[PDB]
Ligand binder design. Structure first.
Ligand SMILES: Nc1nc2c(ncn2[C@H]2C[C@H](O)[C@@H](COP(=O)(O)OP(=O)(O)OP(=O)(O)O)O2)c(=O)[nH]1
Ligand SMILES: [Mg+2]
Ligand SMILES: [Mn+2]
Length: 567
DNA sequence: GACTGCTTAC
DNA sequence: ACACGTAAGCAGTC
């Protein structure tokens, strides 16, 4: 059995002088076996000898320093596991999962140390993990702005902080390990846990591995959340209003909607109703016009004729070439007049409900009876199961290298593909979610300001009748009354501000409130820049050079300030 | 445009 | 083989 260590670095912040000044490691199963020191050389000597599993919190950061050292001390990158090489799992999106450092083989047994990201299991800051896992946490922080020359000696206080940090993570990881949550990521524990419940034999039967060609066809119909701002309210100062948000929307669809399973049947032309294959994806070419009084529902991506984020009123004289689930197509027919519809071909599926019951019951109970990180973890188990079913087969990743200037660079690796999980489930989970949210928005047409995926933002403070019997703060698939606001302003998708009514005892109301809480929502905008925002300055053209940007420099990674501009 | 390489809102 | 998802976005290179 391989030993497991919780590890951390403390690093300098200068582009011209980027290095580790402190490191710590601690045996997760024996806290007495730990060590803190001021030399990366000393840490990496231990790394190469220990032949164990290491965890850093935010491997993307520490990993840069580790790979900088490896490239300087005779290691090259290799997928083959050759002596004096290292392998990585770094995704196309720049997510770090693994560094596997190989010293060679004794016979057929690999001599290696593997380094994982604890952030993939526990995606919270260390102090938040301590608070919600109820672990010991020291008050205060290391001063990162302090000058620290090579050989700088670690103070007793700094020592205690490093030791605390690695112990918090060690303790939290062990809590999860002893629960059987032992995979390298939350998502991986999620899919495995679901397979444990239904059995692997049943998984294979009910969710067969589709061919890459068929999977690709299915994925044409795979889309995400309905995120939409009503033109009527775009960039206007709004008065009183409210937000409702579905409790676990996608898991609620998984729980109760008609969903596909098994091998699809290919058909040509228009789908013909088949009660045993009641779900389908249809390939069409058509033109369309939005019906008066209906919310637009069609957005077209990867087309030279359309803005991909724009919900379309009209096909505008071009032919829309679409692969659509039956859920989407019926919603399209409800909201649009369709013209010159060419039904080309498609795929039909067997379907049933309840395939995720026990799994959803388990994690919902945990979600409903927990708070903070624990609640958020339960939420992630539910949502990552959906994600795992729609896992892209393309697992091509990034290959690190040391460039001439001594900083790490990356190149796109060789094409790698893995088996599809079950992409039709992904297609229909999101289609039903879109249906749920859009049906509610449409029933609130007179008051609807904005939707993002599973929310409705409404003018006025009275609960609409369409959801009045299904408002609840926790219950699966019910609408939580998220907030009531005194005023708001919506510039564009995922970009809005609200003055929310609050009460001290939490969410408040126009009659009973003690405080007004200014809330900024803006995709891309980081926390310090949000603190700059006011009702007055929140507008297209707003810009602040205060967005931290991680930059590869010689020795590792530093944060430098970049701009964020509302363009 | 494609691409790299980051963010937050779901 | 390991490795949850789309969406909307900003700031760059070539
Ligand atoms: N695959 C995946 N989907 C997510 C994730 N976060 C949100 N989503 C999708 C699925 C969610 O049901 C949906 C709406 O997000 P919310 O933030 O409202 O979470 P949800 O509604 O699940 O729970 P809550 O509203 O917190 O009770 O967006 C994620 O981390 N992974
Ligand atoms: Mg939501
Ligand atoms: Mn929700």
């Amino acid at each position: 059995p391989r030993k497991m260590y919780s590890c951390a670095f403390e690093t300098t912040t200068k582009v011209e002088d980027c290095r580790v000044w402190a490191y710590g490691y601690m045996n997760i199963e024996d806290h007495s076996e730990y060590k803190i020191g001021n030399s990366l050389d000393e840490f990496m000597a231990w790394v190469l000898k220990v032949q164990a599993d290491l965890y850093f919190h935010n491997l993307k950061f520490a990993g840069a320093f580790i790979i900088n050292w490896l490239e300087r001390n005779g290691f090259k990158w290799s997928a083959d596991g050759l002596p004096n090489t290292y392998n990585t799992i770094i995704s196309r999106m720049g997510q770090w999962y693994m560094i596997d450092i190989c010293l060679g083989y004794k016979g057929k047994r690999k001599i290696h140390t593997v380094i994982y990201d604890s952030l993939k299991k526990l995606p919270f800051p260390v102090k938040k993990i301590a608070k919600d896992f109820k672990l010991t946490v020291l008050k205060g922080d290391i001063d990162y702005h302090k000058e620290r020359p090579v050989g700088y000696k670690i103070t007793p206080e700094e020592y205690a902080y490093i030791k605390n940090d690695i112990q918090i993570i060690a303790e939290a990881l062990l809590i999860q390990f002893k629960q059987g949550l032992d995979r390298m990521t939350a998502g991986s524990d999620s899919l495995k846990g679901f397979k444990d419940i239904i059995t692997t034999k049943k998984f294979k039967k009910v969710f067969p591995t589709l061919s890459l060609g068929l999977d690709k066809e299915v994925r044409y119909a795979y889309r995400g959340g309905f995120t939409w701002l009503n033109d009527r309210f775009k960039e206007k100062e709004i008065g009183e209003g409210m937000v409702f948000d579905v409790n676990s929307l996608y898991p609620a669809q998984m729980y109760s909607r008609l969903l596909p399973y098994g091998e699809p049947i290919v058909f040509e032309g228009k789908y013909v109703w088949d009660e045993d294959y009641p779900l389908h994806i249809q390939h069409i070419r058509c033109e369309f016009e939005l019906k008066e009084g209906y919310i637009p529902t069609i957005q077209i991506k990867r087309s030279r004729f359309y803005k991909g984020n724009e919900y379309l009123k009209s096909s505008g004289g071009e032919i829309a070439d679409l692969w659509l689930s039956n859920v989407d197509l019926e919603l399209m027919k409800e909201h649009y007049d369709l013209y010159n519809v060419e039904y080309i071909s498609g795929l039909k599926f067997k379907a049933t409900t309840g395939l995720f019951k026990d799994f959803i019951d388990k994690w919902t109970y945990i979600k409903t009876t927990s708070e903070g990180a624990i609640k958020q973890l339960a939420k992630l188990m539910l949502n990552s199961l959906y994600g795992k079913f729609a896992s892209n087969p393309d697992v091509t990743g990034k290959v690190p290298y040391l460039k001439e200037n001594g900083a790490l660079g990356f190149r796109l690796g060789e094409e790698e593909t893995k088996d599809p999980v079950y992409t039709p489930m992904g297609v229909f989970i999101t289609a039903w979610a879109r249906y749920t949210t859009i049906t509610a928005a449409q029933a609130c047409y007179d008051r609807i300001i904005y939707c993002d995926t599973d929310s409705i933002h409404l003018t006025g403070t009275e609960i609409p009748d369409v959801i009045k019997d299904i408002v609840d703060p926790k219950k699966l698939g019910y609408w939580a009354h998220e907030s009531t606001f005194k005023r708001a302003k919506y510039l564009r998708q995922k970009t809005y501000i609200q003055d929310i009514y609050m009460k001290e005892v939490v969410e408040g109301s126009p009659d009973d409130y003690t405080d007004i809480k200014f809330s900024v929502k803006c995709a891309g905008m980081t926390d310090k820049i949000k603190k700059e925002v006011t009702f007055e300055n929140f507008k297209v053209g707003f810009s602040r050079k205060m967005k931290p940007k991680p930059v590869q420099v010689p020795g590792g990674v530093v944060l430098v300030d970049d701009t964020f501009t509302i363009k």
